[PDB]
Amino acid sequence: SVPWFPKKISDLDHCANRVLMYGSELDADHPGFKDNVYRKRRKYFADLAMNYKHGDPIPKVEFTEEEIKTWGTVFQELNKLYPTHACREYLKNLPLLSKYCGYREDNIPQLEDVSNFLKERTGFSIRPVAGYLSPRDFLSGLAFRVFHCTQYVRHSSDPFYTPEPDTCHELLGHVPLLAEPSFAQFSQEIGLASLGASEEAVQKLATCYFFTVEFGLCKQDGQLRVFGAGLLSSISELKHALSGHAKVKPFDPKITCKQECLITTFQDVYFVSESFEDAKEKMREFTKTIK
Ligand SMILES: CCn1c(=O)[nH]c(=O)c2c1nc(Cc1cn3cc(C)sc3n1)n2Cc1ccc(-c2ccn(C)n2)cc1
Ligand SMILES: [Fe+3]
Numbered sequence: 335s336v337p338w339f340p341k342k343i344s345d346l347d348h349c350a351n352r353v354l355m356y357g358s359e360l361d362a363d364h365p366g367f368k369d370n371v372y373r374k375r376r377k378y379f380a381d382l383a384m385n386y387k388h389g390d391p392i393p394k395v396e397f398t399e400e401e402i403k404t405w406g407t408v409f410q411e412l413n414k415l416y417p418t419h420a421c422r423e424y425l426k427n428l429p430l431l432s433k434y435c436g437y438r439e440d441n442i443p444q445l446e447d448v449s450n451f452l453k454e455r456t457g458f459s460i461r462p463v464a465g466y467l468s469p470r471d472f473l474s475g476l477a478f479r480v481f482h483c484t485q486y487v488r489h490s491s492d493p494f495y496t497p498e499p500d501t502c503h504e505l506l507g508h509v510p511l512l513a514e515p516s517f518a519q520f521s522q523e524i525g526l527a528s529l530g531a532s533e534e535a536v537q538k539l540a541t542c543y544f545f546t547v548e549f550g551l552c553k554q555d556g557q558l559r560v561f562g563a564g565l566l567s568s569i570s571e572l573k574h575a576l577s578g579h580a581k582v583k584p585f586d587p588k589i590t591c592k593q594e595c596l597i598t599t600f601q602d603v604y605f606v607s608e609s610f611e612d613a614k615e616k617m618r619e620f621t622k623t624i625k
Contacts (some may be wrong), residue, residue, distance in 0.1 A: 337470070339529040343478040344388040346461060350475070350482065353465040356380050357486065361498070366489040379486040383464035392446040392462055392485075401487040406439040408493050408502050411569050419572055421552050421559040423517060423610070427510040442501070445485055448509055456518035460504075469540035470533075476525025481512060494569050497598050507563030508547075516610040517561075521547060523614060527621040535624045538591040542620070545590050546613055551575060551582060551606045558582070558606065571600050582606050585613055587620035 340346050357380035358373060366372035382393050397405075416425060431437045435447045445460050452458035461475065463482035475482045481504075488500040496503075511517045524547075528539050549562035558576055565572045574580055583589070585605040593603060607613040 336530045339470075340474050340478070343480060346475055346478065346480055347388050349471040350461060350463060350467070351384060352467065352471055353384075353463075354468060356465040357383070357463075357484065359465065364489070364498070365491045369489065372489055376486055379462075379484075380464045383462035383485065386462050388461070392444070392449060392460060394444050394446060395485065397442045397487065400490050402440060402442055404487055404490045404493045405442045405502055408488075408567070408569075409437075409439050409506065411494070412506060412567065412572070415569065415572055416566075419560050419576055420566060421561045422554055423514040424510045424561060424566065427513040430513065431510060437505070442487070443505055445483060445501075445504075448505065452509065452512050455513045456515050458512040458518055458521075470528060470531075470536045473525050473528040473536065473539060473543065476521050477529050478525070479518060479522050481508060481521075483508075503563060503567035507565075507567035510566075511547075511561060511563070514610070516614070520610050520614040520617070523617060523621075527617070527625065531625055535621075538587075538624055539621075541591045541593065541595060542587050542617060544595045545593065545605045546585065546607060549575075549601055549604060550585070550613075551604050552610070552613075553606055553608055561607075561610075562604075574600055575604055580604055584608075585616065587616055588623075591620075 340349060358377040360367050360373065360376065386392065416428065435443045435451050437443055445462060449460040456479065458479045458481060460483045461480050462485045467482065472482055483504040484499045485501050488496045488502060524539055524543050528536050547562065548564040552559055552561050560566060560572060560575055565575050581603045583603055583605055585607040590605050596602060
């Protein structure tokens with residue numbers, strides 16, 4: 335039989351809370367694992383997300399001087415690389431975010447402001463999320479153009495690397511592309527395909543999501559560029575992906591969905607999409623075969 339799936343955007347209240355691992359449940363190897371102050375801060379953020387209901391303004395947070403410094407460090411170094419590494423759609427939308435949502439070295443943008451910006455541009459919106467969700471619940475958000483977003487900042491001891499999502503990743507990696515209509519349609523269709531799909535189908539859609547939205551490359555004017563959010567917020571892997579040292583393959587869902595998604599290392603392979611339009615067409619053809 336068909337599993338429950340959300341039928342309207344407020345139904346995400348029922349699955350967005352089905353958290354399998356709360357944001358305060360730090361990995362044993364987390365730089366903040368023994369940091370009681372950081373742990374309390376992470377509990378604060380996770381509780382904000384747990385208490386959020388669709389329709390609410392996303393709670394505004396007063397970030398600490400330390401948090402803002404971490405953001406600034408990441409922001410400065412990544413912005414030096416984006417002109418030569420990022421796809422054209424990313425570079426087009428980044429300056430709009432500095433103008434309208436307060437993207438600056440000494441200011442962390444509020445999720446509510448970014449959500450309002452996205453709603454006007456592509457109808458995307460943000461929901462703060464309280465931890466790790468099943469791929470079914472996470473992807474279902476995309477069907478309503480809702481991106482489940484972390485609100486906390488990575489631990490200050492290691493500004494440039496983390497295997498965990500944080501708000502620097504959401505804001506610098508994901509949001510500039512969610513502002514692009516072609517990419518928003520691509521992402522929404524991953525969500526729509528997942529609704530009520532088999533467990534097997536959801537897993538394959540999640541792998542395709544991983545190797546596009548999180549770690550995708552695209553080819554533009556003959557050049558390899560980056561659009562994956564996980565690359566766009568990781569200075570070391572961003573450089574690596576466009577070095578000659580990375581294995582790259584064409585994006586092709588029936589092949590891509592066989593690839594293991596790696597967590598604590600660089601990816602073993604990256605997939606190159608010809609365009610967001612073409613990636614979208616390839617996923618349409620693929621979803622017919624698995625539903
Ligand atoms: C379709 C796969 N997929 C899923 O099945 N479910 C998701 O919940 C999910 C996801 N994908 C992403 C987004 C994501 C994960 N991730 C890791 C990076 C490094 S950059 C980045 N973006 N998320 C959101 C998410 C939210 C929180 C955690 C997490 C890990 C450790 N803690 C304490 N919390 C992990 C992932
Ligand atoms: Fe992400």
